[PDB]
Amino acid sequence: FASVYAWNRKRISNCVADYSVLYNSASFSTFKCYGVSPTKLNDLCFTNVYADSFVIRGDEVRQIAPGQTGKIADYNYKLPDDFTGCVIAWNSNNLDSKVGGNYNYLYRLFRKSNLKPFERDISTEIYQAGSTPCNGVEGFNCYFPLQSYGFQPTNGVGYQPYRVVVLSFELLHAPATVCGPKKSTNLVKNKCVNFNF
Amino acid sequence: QCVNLTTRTQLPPAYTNSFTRGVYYPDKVFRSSVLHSTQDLFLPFFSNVTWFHAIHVTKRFDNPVLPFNDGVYFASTEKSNIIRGWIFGTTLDSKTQSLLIVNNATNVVIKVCEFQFCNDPFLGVYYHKNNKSWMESEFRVYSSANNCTFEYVSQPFLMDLEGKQGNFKNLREFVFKNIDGYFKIYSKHTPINLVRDLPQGFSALEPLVDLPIGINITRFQTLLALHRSYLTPGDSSSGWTAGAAAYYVGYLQPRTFLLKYNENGTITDAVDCALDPLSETKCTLKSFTVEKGIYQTSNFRVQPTESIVRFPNITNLCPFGEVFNATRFASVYAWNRKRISNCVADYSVLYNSASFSTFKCYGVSPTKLNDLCFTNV
Amino acid sequence: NGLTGTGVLTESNKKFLPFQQFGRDIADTTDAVRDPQTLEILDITPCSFGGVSVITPGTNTSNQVAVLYQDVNCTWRVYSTGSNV
Amino acid sequence: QIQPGGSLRLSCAASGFSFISNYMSWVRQAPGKGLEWVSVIYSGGSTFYADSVKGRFTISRDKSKNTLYLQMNSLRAEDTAFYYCARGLIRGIIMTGAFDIWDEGTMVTVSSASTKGPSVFPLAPSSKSTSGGTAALGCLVKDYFPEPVTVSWNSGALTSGVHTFPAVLQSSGLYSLSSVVTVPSSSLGTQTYICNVNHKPSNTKVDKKVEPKS
Amino acid sequence: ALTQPPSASGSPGQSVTISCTGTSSDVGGSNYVSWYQQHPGKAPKLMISEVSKRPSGVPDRFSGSKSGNTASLTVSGLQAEDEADYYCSSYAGSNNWVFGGGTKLTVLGQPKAAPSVTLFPPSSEELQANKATLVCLISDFYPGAVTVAWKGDSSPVKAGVETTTPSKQSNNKYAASSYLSLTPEQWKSHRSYSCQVTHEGSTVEKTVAPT
Ligand SMILES: *[C@@H]1O[C@H](CO)[C@@H](O[C@@H]2O[C@H](CO)[C@@H](O)[C@H](O)[C@H]2NC(C)=O)[C@H](O)[C@H]1NC(C)=O
Ligand SMILES: *[C@@H]1O[C@H](CO)[C@@H](O[C@@H]2O[C@H](CO)[C@@H](O)[C@H](O)[C@H]2NC(C)=O)[C@H](O)[C@H]1NC(C)=O
Ligand SMILES: CCCCC/C=C\C/C=C/CCCCCCCC(=O)O
Ligand SMILES: *[C@@H]1O[C@H](CO)[C@@H](O)[C@H](O)[C@H]1NC(C)=O
Ligand SMILES: *[C@@H]1O[C@H](CO)[C@@H](O)[C@H](O)[C@H]1NC(C)=O
Ligand SMILES: *[C@@H]1O[C@H](CO)[C@@H](O)[C@H](O)[C@H]1NC(C)=O
Ligand SMILES: *[C@@H]1O[C@H](CO)[C@@H](O)[C@H](O)[C@H]1NC(C)=O
Ligand SMILES: *[C@@H]1O[C@H](CO)[C@@H](O)[C@H](O)[C@H]1NC(C)=O
Ligand SMILES: *[C@@H]1O[C@H](CO)[C@@H](O)[C@H](O)[C@H]1NC(C)=O
Ligand SMILES: *[C@@H]1O[C@H](CO)[C@@H](O)[C@H](O)[C@H]1NC(C)=O
Ligand SMILES: *[C@@H]1O[C@H](CO)[C@@H](O)[C@H](O)[C@H]1NC(C)=O
């Protein structure tokens, strides 16, 4: 996947959304939808589908929600207050950890201001905590703004790495291309019918 | 390949009026024979837009760095394809990510990576007489492009690039918005026949694209094309001819408009419900015609000019390290209770010392914790 | 002290007891406040005030209009001044 | 002691260090002048050194246990000083820029020649030292390394006016001092005034008589 | 380095000031100025933090301020025992970290004393020893901020001189000594030398001529 400070964003185009094929391949343990109920997912068509993905600590999974504070939600990944998609996260200690620690995963620790929703800050300029500048060297009151998680395999759960996918989309209003597993019928005109368009 | 141009004359800026320009379809729903009231980022009616040109003979190649406040209405009157695109960003100097929309003579290129832009970015067309052709020669925009995130390249084509000598025949209008990491572009092309001073009329811009770029934007700059031929001796920084084009820039603000859809579904007119009291009444009446009389409008409003904050004189930081970092806690049947007095609540200092995994507030939202004062802590 | 708002601040004659910080009117809006650094009382007055009417001869005849500010006395809180006041 | 061109290991304890903003500078002090900064280590792995030291000294922290190492290499014998471990003071994430915990330091001496015996001269009583009823005479004992040295007057007899001044450390690296005593000017040469010089690290014992100038 | 005057003292139960008067870009161009304290034998102890702040302990007689390129300390009330050195300190530009010079702070409850000076020329045996040393002894000068200057016939000299730091005697006043290195041909070259000592503005000098 990707680390959280430079998070990936994949575009989901014209395809069929059958999420039952996942029933035998992976469990989740966090799966929350926001603009829509989970019982009507395979009955709708979705307009702008995007899939963000990253890896965070197990304790920070609660931060992936609208209206949150903390290290991830302040300046690593911010959701809007009118969010619509679904948030999914699963434990990944058997994959993304190794003996001695896996330092391929980073996070931002210092910033001047909070992020706006759905922006990305991949700059590595040295954060100035003091009044005197420091001209691009680390030292007195100047820190490198990115740190690494330490993922050794026997950690307390919640220090173990979690993979998080955020599904973003829209409903009705515009043309869609995803749809669910529903099957179509013929067009009956000039009669009273229930319809699903 | 990056030059600082010269042989440019000095002039003050020019301004113009926007005669009810810059309206776009605010959703993707079809409406017919109706008047719809909508609030959004619009260009106010009869606004003072800024005017930029480039006519040589006097040379005038305007492409300064302009603010991008809340959105931009951009209009271009041309005949020979001089404006080619824009660059958007905050510093434009490879310490931050920037967006580039450009039109080569063959493709449209959109790229959102780390560019090192020049002081005078441009393109350049060369004109031969021996060979019967204007051809695209220079592309001098950036020096480097390191950590790209988004990229799109259109299907190939070939533009004309040929220099005309008549009057401005093409008007192209764009609206640029940037919200929730989406860069939205609305566009409209119109055939005109004009000499200067962006015209009057009404045409609604249709949605062009939404790019998921996710960057911060506060400034932007226009990309113009240059002309070089056997009559431009120079060396490479004085031997250029400008051409002929003009473009106008205005800024959007949040307004309420009343749009009119004809029977075919086209927006043909609009009322700016905050331009005058007359328009206030037109808009509260939901009609374009007002009958003789006297009408009550809203009370007289005054807008705030400044923002002030007044907190008490507190210097210390709260004991975050002797509450969360204690050595030995208490058992639950005899639980401890510490009194928090006059101190500063900076809970960001905990961001690198301890994770939590349960943190729930009850009377207050977590996004307003460092904006309040607390009484009995 | 965390309480946000909009208005005009003026020097006050109210005098708070030491355990008081805000003052409220009958509609329960905050109309007085003690400044937390200078310990002086201030009154907070709203900013919008006064009715406005527009007189038109009909927009099917002209778009000339007149405006009546029902709370102004000129001998200003107006949108424009033009001529013929 | 260590001859120049050597090396030395100075170690201290970085208890509670891995949090960022935890500077642990090192500061020297010459025996008599005053304080002077030497080096600094920042907990994000950054090292910085003062001038006139740079390239010869190196900090290499042990992230294994907790121990902090300053390796001095090729000492120039103008570094003889107490060396302190100054731990910083932090106001949250902001380094305050002051050192609150010290450690009493280690004495680091750099010399040469090892040891040496004193050279003695008698400083005669003179009219330029004479004033009215009294005149002063003494003994100058100079150029010795092994610090503890003693000079008595007349095998310990005279205790009046006998004052031995603190030894001085020259640029040559050897000590020197002079002990003087006043005695009535009527008694310039009259009685015995013999300074007994004893050097205890060596075995030097010499008696020198002081008499008025010829 | 920075500058602070090496001697300042006053009556017990009063206010004494100490100026640090650095340049710009360490003291004027910053705000991280501190003050320490070193009793004669112990480690330094942080006495005043940034500008004007205190740790715990540190009884509120000590105060600090900054007025540009000069920060200053002020002790309001000498109890009996605040004799120290009081180094001021600052963070300079590039992680530099500069220091001060140190000011002794006594409290002569009685009346100042006069530095008794005594000067000796190189003995005869030393003349025969192909060398020469002038000996300047200072004694009994209560308040210890003495300094010394050496003189050839008319000019000052600054080479070949060593100066002891003041040392406390039994009577709890001070003593010091200085040595001048000379080749005997330079000893007879100049017609006379002298040692001068300055102490609280006042000055006393002694002089000797070769034979
Ligand atoms: C174009 O002109 C600009 C000045 O307007 C030149 O800018 C400086 O560039 C150097 C690096 O080469 C920087 O260190 C300076 O800080 C810049 N100063 C300013 C005022 O910008 C630029 O070098 C010129 N480039 C060319 C090709 O002429
Ligand atoms: C809060 O701090 C301000 C300064 O930051 C203090 O204001 C001073 O007030 C005294 C009145 O006794 C004036 O003489 C000073 O000139 C003020 N200083 C400034 C910079 O304006 C204020 O006193 C502090 N609050 C309290 C309760 O003391
Ligand atoms: C020392 C007690 C001071 C209490 C101040 C009173 C109110 C201010 C509330 C602060 C909430 C602190 C929670 C820490 C959130 C960090 C989230 C994370 O870990 O990512
Ligand atoms: C956008 O960039 C500007 C640079 O001037 C910066 O001040 C601002 O904080 C950035 N946006 C956010 C939301 O921080
Ligand atoms: C636009 O604003 C400028 C600002 O000074 C002013 O000079 C100019 O007259 C304005 N133009 C119009 C048409 O109001
Ligand atoms: C125009 O620029 C894009 C940017 O990479 C490039 O891919 C394209 O090939 C260029 N046009 C032509 C005709 O090569
Ligand atoms: C036209 O001639 C120019 C040289 O004058 C050459 O660079 C260019 O490639 C030629 N183009 C064609 C189509 O011949
Ligand atoms: C951007 O480039 C820098 C330097 O080449 C590199 O350190 C950094 O990892 C790059 N960004 C990403 C997301 O890899
Ligand atoms: C749409 O309406 C216009 C007049 O407003 C009319 O000229 C045109 O024919 C209509 N379009 C059609 C034919 O659907
Ligand atoms: C408390 O802080 C110390 C560092 O001072 C750290 O080593 C320890 O792990 C912390 N313990 C808790 C419970 O925070
Ligand atoms: C007002 O305009 C309408 C349509 O243009 C017209 O039918 C009407 O007659 C006009 N009013 C008068 C009084 O003529």
Residue numbers in the entry:
A (entry chain B): 347 to 543
B (entry chain C): 14 to 70, 76 to 395
C (entry chain C): 544 to 618, 633 to 642
D (entry chain I): 11 to 224
E (entry chain M): 3 to 213
What do the authors say?
To investigate the binding mode of antibody 2G1 on S trimer, we solved the cryo-electron microscopy (cryo-EM) structure of 2G1 in complex with S trimer at 2.7 Å resolution. Yet, the cryo-EM map density on the interface between RBD and 2G1 was smeared. So, we performed local refinement and improved the antibody-antigen interface resolution to 3.2 Å, enabling reliable analysis of the interactions between the RBD and 2G1. For detailed analysis of the interface, antibody 2G1 binds to tip area of RBD of S trimer, overlapping with the ACE2 binding site on RBD and offset from the major mutational hotspots in VOCs. The heavy chain of 2G1 interacts with RBD mainly through three complementarity-determining regions (CDRs), named CDRH1 (residues 30–35), CDRH2 (residues 50–65), and CDRH3 (residues 98–111). The light chain of 2G1 participates interaction mainly through two CDRs, CDRL1 (residues 23 to 36) and CDRL3 (residues 91–100). The interface between RBD and 2G1 is stabilized by an extensive hydrophobic interaction network. Phe486 on the RBD top loop interacts with Tyr33, Tyr52 on heavy chain and Tyr34, Tyr93, and Trp99 on light chain through hydrophobic and/or π–π interactions simultaneously. CDRH1 and CDRH3 of the 2G1 heavy chain were positioned above the LA-binding pocket in the adjacent RBD’.
Receptor binding domain (RBD) on the S protein is a determinant that mediates the binding of SARS-CoV-2 to the angiotensin converting enzyme 2 (ACE2). Here we describe a monoclonal antibody, 2G1, that neutralizes all current VOCs and has surprising tolerance to mutations adjacent to or within its interaction epitope. Cryo-electron microscopy structure showed that 2G1 bound to the tip of receptor binding domain (RBD) of spike protein with small contact interface but strong hydrophobic effect, which resulted in nanomolar to sub-nanomolar affinities to spike proteins. The epitope of 2G1 on RBD partially overlaps with angiotensin converting enzyme 2 (ACE2) interface, which enables 2G1 to block interaction between RBD and ACE2.
